[PDB]
A = this chain, B = another copy of it.
Amino acid sequence: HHHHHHMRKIYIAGPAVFNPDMGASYYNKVRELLKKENVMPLIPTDNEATEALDIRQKNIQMIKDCDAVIADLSPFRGHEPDCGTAFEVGCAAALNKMVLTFTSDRRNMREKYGSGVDKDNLRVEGFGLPFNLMLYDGVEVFDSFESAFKYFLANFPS
């Protein structure tokens, strides 16, 4: 009786923070979905500090604390995912955390750019993947937060 009970935690990585509402609508949808499953969202803007290094360190700690990262790798300011999100996925990979990714655009990079090179003759990756291959670890690239979360529930039981 009354053993410690772990509450599952997911780090919510993605450029929704740059939305005019600072991610509110995105984070609210995440909160409502996770609440049903007794899963804690670890959100980048939670208890926000004022200094860049403090913000960064708190986010890195969230990744250390999490059971998984669900990362929004949707196009940000062009065809490439957000670099902040990419940094967070790298952190998670190094820490051997479950990393689940999604995007609004699942086309191959070469389909997105329409060629094997960009407008400046720089090479576009040709590995049949939607984004930089460093961001792919073998887990299916999902179509939405919701489909990534379903994988989490099926693969990280309470």
Contacts and interface: CB of A to CB of B under 8 A. Distances in A.
Interface string A1-45: 000000000000001011110100000000000000000000000
A135 to B, nearest CB: 6
Interface in A76-101: 76-84, 86-95
A68 interface: no
A150 interface: no
Contacts of A86: 83-84, 86-87, 90
7 contacts: A20-B122, A20-B123, A52-B127, A63-B94, A82-B83, A83-B86, A90-B94
Contact of A123 (B18, B52, B124, B132): B18
Q: Which of A53, A76, A84, A137 has the most CB of B within 10 A?
A: A84
A134 interface: yes
A104 to B, nearest CB: 14
Given A90-B88, A91-B94, A123 B83 contact: no
Contacts of A127: 52
Given A20-B123, A83-B86, A122-B18, A133 B55 contact: yes
A131 interface: yes
A119 to B, nearest CB: 9
A79 to B, nearest CB: 8
Nearest to A135: B87
